[PDB]
Design a protein around this nucleic acid. Sequence first.
DNA 1: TTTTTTTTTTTTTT
Lengths: 589, 438
Amino acid sequence: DAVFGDRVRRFQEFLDTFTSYRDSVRSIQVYNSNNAANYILPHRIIISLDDLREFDRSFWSGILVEPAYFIPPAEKALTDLADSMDDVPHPWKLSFKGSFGAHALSPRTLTAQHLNKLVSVEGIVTKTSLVRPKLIRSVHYAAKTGRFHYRDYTDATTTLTTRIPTPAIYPTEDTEGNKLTTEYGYSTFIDHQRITVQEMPEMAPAGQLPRSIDVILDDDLVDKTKPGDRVNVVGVFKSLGAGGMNQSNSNTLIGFKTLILGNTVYPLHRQMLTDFDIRNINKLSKKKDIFDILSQSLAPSIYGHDHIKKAILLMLMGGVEKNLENGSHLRGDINILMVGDPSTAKSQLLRFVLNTASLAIATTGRGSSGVGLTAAVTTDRETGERRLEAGAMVLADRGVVCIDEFDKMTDVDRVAIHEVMEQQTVTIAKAGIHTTLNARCSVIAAANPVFGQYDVNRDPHQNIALPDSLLSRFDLLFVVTDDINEIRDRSISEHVLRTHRVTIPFLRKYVQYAKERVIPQLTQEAINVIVKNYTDLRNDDNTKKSPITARTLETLIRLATAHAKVRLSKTVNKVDAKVAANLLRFALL
Amino acid sequence: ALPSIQLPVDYNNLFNEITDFLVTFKQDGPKYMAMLQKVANRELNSVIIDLDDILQYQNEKFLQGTQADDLVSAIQQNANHFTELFCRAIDNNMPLPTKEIDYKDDVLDVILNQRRLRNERMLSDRTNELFPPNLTRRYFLYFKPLSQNCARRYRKKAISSKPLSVRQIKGDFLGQLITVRGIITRVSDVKPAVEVIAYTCDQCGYEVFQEVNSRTFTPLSECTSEECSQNQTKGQLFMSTRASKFSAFQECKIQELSQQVPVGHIPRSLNIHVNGTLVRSLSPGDIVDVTGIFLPAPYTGFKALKAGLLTETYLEAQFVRQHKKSDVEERVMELITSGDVYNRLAKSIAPEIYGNLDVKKALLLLLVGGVDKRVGDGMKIRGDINVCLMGDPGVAKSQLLKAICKISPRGVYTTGKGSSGVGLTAAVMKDPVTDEMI
DNA sequence: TTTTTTTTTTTTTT
Ligand SMILES: Nc1ncnc2c1ncn2[C@@H]1O[C@H](COP(=O)(O)OP(=O)(O)NP(=O)(O)O)[C@@H](O)[C@H]1O
């Protein structure tokens, strides 16, 4: 393998020329020892492939083409270099970027030639085969002859190059027959995983279904990504396994299940605000009509319903949280529902909450099993371990669940749905594992009138379609009438017609920032009013309609707090409460 | 064939350091000289060796020279060998007599007494390579963590120390003694396991001791003993269950805290083993700082199935620190002299919930209940207060109950679904995992 | 030289 060293001395020139990589190299080499001065760093480096055409194109192409012959000596080169660095006081890894490609492709298609080559391939993460650590290097200590003894085990999944079947036994008393004890806490174990990726369902060509394919995640790549996330996954596509021709079994056509090793795994759509941007965020934040402004831009086509819009943004903040000490939490995230005659744009309105909201996942009615319930993947998958897997609502943790036809979901689902909102967790007894896992989620749905257009005529009782405690947990019930005004109908027409014929993306960039910086806490000014308001409700709102509870007031907290994040005020203020007093009026009238 | 490479780590001198570590010390006579005796005295089984005094003893071994090689860090970086070495030298300086051993008295105490007396006496006839040191112990060794306020000596980073989540748990943590925290779940019932395990032989006897290594082993008969062997034809031999020793074993999974976890990502429970005097220490649904040696245990198998070898590992128990564990009538006697026992203690019920002390008033009747009576035949007349609530929707009446069972003796907090029929009527709900039909 | 497997979805049914 003289050429193996040739790839290295070719790339050795690339070491220090250009040296723009050595900065982060050294940086790892420093922040590790700075954590060593504490009182965690991964070893691997992003390399934009873009630069490499500026040295050897002849080396460039093969990096994608036959990485088994190229990437391991340059891999060795990272380690070689970094070892030449200070200071005395590990195999490393790589990623790259792209800057692609041939080799630009989506998971929907692959092979023949596409195999055995570096590729970037993007998409949905499912089903997340769960983590187990893996054996690589063996080590043992002889006595009384002493010394230190070892082996190095190599799976077909490790590295790239084909190698003799190392596995699987401890060397165990190498000659002369001296006892050899496992070196545990010495010998190397890198964690391993296999994660399939489904191509985006909407970009599917035809009635043909989505096809996922697995990608092995070694070292860091594990725990980086949960299921359901959009991820560009890069690495080299291995031809793996016997062709059924290893043995007499089986006499058949089928064979060669295969996946991709390495490499990078970037998430896609967080975010990156620099300075110049957030300066705009705050420049706008100063303006006092901006709440309404942000509300209007939500629905480019849709008419008005600005009170509903506001309500949505109020859910888009999260309305902070407060966790008790040694007691149960006070839910701060906001749960609402839409109701009204068909063609209210309720479903389509949900589809706006599909993209800007930074998750979570929406569902049409069904739904289940238990939605966010894991429903206990069974049996095992794999190696004799019964496993759970992310359910809808779980995947939706700290995100937006949305529902088309929450009225059409089963009565049996509703049980765990109560468990979704008050208890705000997930209880699992099924086989099984008894874990109570956090279900804390922002949840909005829509329901149609139980019977026809009578949504307006009939009392809310019987118009519910989903009694009862379901109604309590809802911060708002929104009745939207299809009722006719020809005066309005002209307006209804023209904007709808100019349809087919204040910026939202920035709205996401702003909302995200308003979450973490900052939480408002509270001031007594809102308190000096909304109390008067609540009792005012109870002594009045019962002479009109129902219901009224303490909970509906707790929403005054959440609502006010939501707009409090909208003002980006470091604290809650009275006028925010006035925004709440606004929203609940139109909630019941 | 098995390349071999030098490393700064050497067991040779560290053994000696262990000899000087035990029985020679002051700050805590010393703890290692007569407590070791009290084990050999048979008033105690667990040998608690603190990382604390490993630190303070290195304060005696450095500051305060002459300087000594690393311990607690070398410990928690390996974690397993230090119970096979640090403990193996304990045999040397252990007190002989010790005091009042008797013989039987204790069952099998005479067995081992006469084991090595019939062994040496049957070895005395042949002389006119020994039962392994782990065979005679009757003491477990438990390391305990250093948090620590005196870890601030400091060695800084080397302290874990932290009760990290299993998400935080990593593959390089194999062979590393660490702290982990989390809820107890499914907590397999205590079972004996095994240790050496002497199987008798049939014609001329003698004995051989098969070491208990790993999770499984091959049984053996043939004949090892030279006299039953080759003449004639081979001495048969069977296992003697009273010649066996069993270390205590109870394995229990511990689930993640769930706030340790990222928002998605279903809870990941981890596998733990219990060994020794620390058996029965852990019960279902219990948060604890649990420290222990974390080792791979492949495989059985399968085998060629896995690949890579993909260890699947497990944890062993070492230490347990559990969060939240007349003169009592005198503690009651400010309340006895307080007067107004009934209305005041009625105010004391659920002091959180405001109003309706008229309700709490009856809840008071409940907490005490009583007195029943027995008719002399007899058939009990309750005796038990079944009082119910009403009204709706929330009221936080759930709080009334929530505090009541939290306080009232032998309480059960339930709901509709909730405790089922089989959640209330003893049936035969198949037991998951460990079997069966409990 | 062999290893090892009961929920979840849907269904037709009194
Ligand atoms: N401003 C608007 N207001 C109302 N509807 C609109 C508006 N703009 C577009 N639409 C259309 O109105 C329809 C709304 O249907 P929608 O009620 O959201 O679905 P749906 O509720 O699931 N059907 P249904 O379950 O019977 O209520 C869609 O065809 C939208 O494209």
